[PDB]
Homo-oligomer: 383 residues x 4
Amino acid sequence: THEIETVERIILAAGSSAASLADLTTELGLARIAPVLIDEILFRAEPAPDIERTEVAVQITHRGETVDFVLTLQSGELIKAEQRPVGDVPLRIGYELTDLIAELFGPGAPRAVGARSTNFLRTTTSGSIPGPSELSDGFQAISAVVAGCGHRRPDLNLLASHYRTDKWGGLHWFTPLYERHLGEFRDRPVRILEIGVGGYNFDGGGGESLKMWKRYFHRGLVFGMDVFDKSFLDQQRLCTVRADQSKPEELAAVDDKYGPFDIIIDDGSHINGHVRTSLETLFPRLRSGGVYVIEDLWTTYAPGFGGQAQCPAAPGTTVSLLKNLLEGVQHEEQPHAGSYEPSYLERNLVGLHTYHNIAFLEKGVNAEGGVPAWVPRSLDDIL
Amino acid sequence: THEIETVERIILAAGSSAASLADLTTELGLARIAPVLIDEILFRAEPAPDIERTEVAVQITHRGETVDFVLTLQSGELIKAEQRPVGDVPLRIGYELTDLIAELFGPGAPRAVGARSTNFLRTTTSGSIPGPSELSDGFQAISAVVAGCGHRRPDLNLLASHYRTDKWGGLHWFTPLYERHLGEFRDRPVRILEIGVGGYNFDGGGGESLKMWKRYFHRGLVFGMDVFDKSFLDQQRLCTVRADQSKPEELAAVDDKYGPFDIIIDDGSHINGHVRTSLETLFPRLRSGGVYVIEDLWTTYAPGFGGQAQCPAAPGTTVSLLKNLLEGVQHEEQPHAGSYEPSYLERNLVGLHTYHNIAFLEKGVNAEGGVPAWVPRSLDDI
Amino acid sequence: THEIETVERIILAAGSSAASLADLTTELGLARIAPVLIDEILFRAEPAPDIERTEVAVQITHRGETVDFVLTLQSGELIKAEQRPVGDVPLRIGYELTDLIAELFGPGAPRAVGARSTNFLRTTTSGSIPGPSELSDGFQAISAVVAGCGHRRPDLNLLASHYRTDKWGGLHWFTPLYERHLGEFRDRPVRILEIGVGGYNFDGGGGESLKMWKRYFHRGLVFGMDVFDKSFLDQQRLCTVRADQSKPEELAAVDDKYGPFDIIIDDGSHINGHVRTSLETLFPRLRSGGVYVIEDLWTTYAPGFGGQAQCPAAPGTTVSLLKNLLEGVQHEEQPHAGSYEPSYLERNLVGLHTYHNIAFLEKGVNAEGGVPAWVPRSLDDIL
Amino acid sequence: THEIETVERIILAAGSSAASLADLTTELGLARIAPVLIDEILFRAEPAPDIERTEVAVQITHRGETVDFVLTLQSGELIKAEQRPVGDVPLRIGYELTDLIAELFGPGAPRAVGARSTNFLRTTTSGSIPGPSELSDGFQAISAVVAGCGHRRPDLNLLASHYRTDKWGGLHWFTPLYERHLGEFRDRPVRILEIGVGGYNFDGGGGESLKMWKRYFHRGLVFGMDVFDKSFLDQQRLCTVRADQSKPEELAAVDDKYGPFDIIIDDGSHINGHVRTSLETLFPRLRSGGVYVIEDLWTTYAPGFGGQAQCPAAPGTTVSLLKNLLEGVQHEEQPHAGSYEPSYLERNLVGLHTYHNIAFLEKGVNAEGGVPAWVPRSLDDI
Ligand SMILES: Nc1ncnc2c1ncn2[C@@H]1O[C@H](CSCC[C@H](N)C(=O)O)[C@@H](O)[C@H]1O
Ligand SMILES: Nc1ncnc2c1ncn2[C@@H]1O[C@H](CSCC[C@H](N)C(=O)O)[C@@H](O)[C@H]1O
Ligand SMILES: Nc1ncnc2c1ncn2[C@@H]1O[C@H](CSCC[C@H](N)C(=O)O)[C@@H](O)[C@H]1O
Ligand SMILES: Nc1ncnc2c1ncn2[C@@H]1O[C@H](CSCC[C@H](N)C(=O)O)[C@@H](O)[C@H]1O
Ligand SMILES: [Mg+2]
Ligand SMILES: [Mg+2]
Ligand SMILES: [Mg+2]
Ligand SMILES: [Mg+2]
């Protein structure tokens, strides 16, 4: 929890004042911040290009202190980093700590120039003209690390295919919809909760969507909730929590410890009652201006999921809930006793987006007022 | 019809090849195109700033030919243009015809530099530092005209307030939602249909929203359908049509004459049956990738509009329709005991956006396939 | 200085974590934050529409505390606000304090829905159908206040015409260039310095550009430096400083007290030596990744400005400086003794943008390395 | 020439009216257009994912006619397409011709939903939950093809690395600067000229940058000029031309045949005189609002490239030229003792962008007027 807190403080400083970032850099120090930034460069530079073992140095300096890391990249292998000297590495990237913190965790347009220093094959051990492979592999190696040092907008469809989540590809085509409804939050220091880590009780299974969310939300903290243990996936900005979406107390404990959440995604049991329980408990805890997403609406018709093989969808099914939420947004126009008090969902659901197998709920203040009484409601009133 | 066609050709060439624009400029000529561009400038420069009567010259040149216009701006007065010599007018703007066509009807980011020439008070009415009012009115006048010569993104909320449509302000707050769902089409040569011009049978009334759509869609042709005549609102890129949204034949005639439409907006009678008839007839005619919008969902509960004062909403009411459209998007996941072929709305509705008093329908191909049979449907399958 | 500090803390919290904003709201309290937000609504809602005197209520609530303000709008008059009851004002806007802080000072896309509550003529004292003026003036009045409650992107050309600065209109056409080079910083908590407040020694003169920068940078602190007093213009997010751009010590004192600056604009004396002194002293103090802007390059040829009526421009003139800066960006490719050490401007100028009467300097690390020795430099080397 | 013209007509119609697209689809027909679209899909879907041989079907329909293609993807292998029946292929993508034309060559935001149909493993090779590799390879294959069917914004840095051009990586870092200055033209039907195809006189060499420009400008026609033959690189939207940048007649011939150009990039000999000759001849031919780019400013100091090893840079060297262009932008503010008429570069250069080893020149109208005579020029004037 102190670890998540330290990464968060760096993320927030990246988007704050110069004085705030200076205070944090002075407080934590280069030795402590550097490894967090190298961890990000490794996660973002993946995957390594199809090249022979090639070393690339990253040097971070701050107020007279400098730390050097040598990253090793090779076709089909996890990129590795080591705090080591760089004098014999002809591929080098240099950064002021303030610049690298912004490059990785800063909001706003990626910088096109001036964020770093570069040394590319200024000396070659081969001879005078560097070998073809040496030159080719060099270009690819330094380019891969540079790509991992920044926050250039990624393509969520490509990320989904790379991390192997079923949010994109033949089973579902949700990623462009996520870009539409969540893209305005990409530069924001978000806390995202996804219910359903993936992999069920299979050992070593799941986390694909969580890694995608970590990559897309460069300033985000990703939380994954599952009834089964997923602690093996825990990493920088990615925390798994063991909890049951059927139990309101367990849901509230997740929010009490890791919330509040800007975005909540239901991709869990798909059991009709669990979807409803999760929305009733977490929608009031969701940040106002946030988005609640329900994936796999098809379970509405599957008895094995507490659904009913009937259309219109049976009450207590996800499609019936979505239809009621739709009418709820119009609560102020509905016939009601003056004493009527709107439900939480009626007052706090400002937008409903329904697509195939997915719904997006926008939380906000639904209180613009019903059509005034002085508006004609009949030709009788017109006349 | 030839007039609407000429403006359309200019708009389409503005986003085409150099050869296509060259061919159109050669065929129509400067004398014909320039008045279309001046009309746009007058429409987009409005309103005139709070200044005393001030003249600004606009000169358009093309392949050895040049035409001069002098615009007159004054507080509270309609901006006027006359084809006259620039002469002594000390506020001047010059353009190559190609640059002005792109500036007014071109897609893409507004140019920040190099699109025109300018002369500002090289000669004053004193012979030296101009009078305080001459300088202030001069800056305001030339700035107003230049603003009218481009396609810089407008604020739809401010346009709705300026043109006085109820789409924004206290009765409704729809304009930001329109920006969200129609913003991607602002650079497109769209044909927009709004059912409901406004003003009912009152003389000289309506057209506020149509003027807003003309200002927002700088490459768009705006069509307003109304059961009553609204020909007095007719102007460049803005055509009114007399037709009844309750009658499928009249809706089809509107589409056959002025379609197809990228965007259709129902802001008409608000009578439940008319909303259903308009959607059933025009949704199939809407361009795929287009957006159908229904305003005033409240009439769902008003008996005077064919509504029923009950909740859940009665069958045959707009909210009930929206709930059925929502379920139809999931048609591939629904149980179908025998041969089923999806309805048009099930197959062509890809997205439903429901807010307070407004719904946005995205038309497309809804055929990604239902969940495959090999997917577990129960722990017994597990 | 405690005032600037308090507005800054609110601005930074608007773009931080939920916990950070909660901590600040709890610390300062609604009573202290509310007036800062009302001050912004008045500055941004200006000008009032051409309407008869109309009242619009803004109500801000936070954790069981609520404060009500009544804004009065009238054709040709400064919008006024008073902490007052709202029961008899039929035009009302309601906000949670967290939502209003983000709406005014938050980074990111303006919210399209759910940020506030609205009451529009639910009761009219006139009768049942409100009068035409009453209805028309109402629409305009509430719309104007709503526009002042947010950060919807403004048009810098229109702002320049409204505030009456010569950056746009016949004398200059710089505002679209400012949008191009400074637009990526609009959502950033910037500190901007403009040298030249305007109005010279004329009493009550100047500040037009400063008000424009305050309006455009909704999260920004605007600083205006002038040899003459301009304290009468001082307001929320807008501080004037008496200092001389000819004196390096006075320039450094401005940066020591109000810096560091993300953006510095020279629109002052236009005296060739003052432009050079200002750039030599403040470019090293400018934030890396920031922009230095020099307006009115025409003084390069005006003897009355220490210029020379000659072309090519004489050494010590702004155009000559810009040409040397241009060559300086290529310092690594220039013939030099190996011992050569790049100047500050050579090492820290990554981009030079020259337009008519204006130049934009991008500060960053100019250290990608010169063309390697192993690159053929002659057909002799080729053969 | 007719082939380049047919692809150009398709691209222009993709951003035109419904009527214009309808007319082109009727005139050319599905049989003619579909192979152009399949060629784009193969170019944009590359590279194939690291999978075992997998087939993906693409079906395009138009007014009662439908054609089927089966694409084959395999690790390290060139993606192949064949016009064959979809048959049993379990990975399928369907498109209406109009939707596919817009998806590949349309301007504007990529569509997030409704642009196509899809079938994914409705039948597996086991009869039940597909084999682990069948499912993984299936997701990768269909995703790769769908990616190739659209105009989603690419990362120019990644494209430069994928196509292996030195515009990015250790020798140069220009691609983000290209995104800044050319990004606004990505949705435009551009004609781009790069002087310098690459590969010199080595057999089979060059074209890396030309392939990058084709991928980035999804509506663009790419032209590569080189003194040596590069016809082997010729492909859809990518034409090589043999011409000498030292010879004004050859540069004019390139423009007369394949112009006018929205963007011209000098990455050729790097010989100082050739850079000056190319700019003097082609800048007047460049579209106003267009961008002229000069790479490799370092040759300014290299005697083997006509440079002089001195600083300040010698007259007749590229850096000296850039310094003179910078001063020319201020031509209206310069003292002119007698009648002066500005040069072409003074009148048509509106912006100069100088970075390390690269310059971006914006062409436009540089005529805002010098400072008016009534402006004080001295405290004596004050
Ligand atoms: N009651 C419950 N509470 C929480 N998680 C549950 C649950 N029942 C099942 N789950 C988990 O929900 C997950 C659904 S699979 C999630 C896949 C992942 N989101 C991706 O897109 O890659 C499984 O891992 C399962 O263990
Ligand atoms: N059956 C029908 N067919 C078409 N238009 C109809 C109609 N019944 C009523 N209308 C028209 O629908 C309009 C509704 S008011 C439209 C307001 C306008 N869109 C604005 O925002 O400014 C009226 O002008 C009315 O005459
Ligand atoms: N040496 C100096 N140091 C600082 N400011 C100076 C100065 N000499 C003159 N100035 C101030 O520079 C200003 C130039 S006018 C600035 C106009 C303003 N930026 C706008 O665009 O609206 C004058 O107010 C003048 O008093
Ligand atoms: N006079 C001349 N006219 C045209 N091309 C020339 C030339 N002299 C040399 N060239 C060509 O200029 C090219 C320079 S290398 C181009 C690299 C390519 N743009 C890339 O980024 O991948 C060589 O292919 C060379 O043959
Ligand atoms: Mg799932
Ligand atoms: Mg309405
Ligand atoms: Mg000035
Ligand atoms: Mg090069």
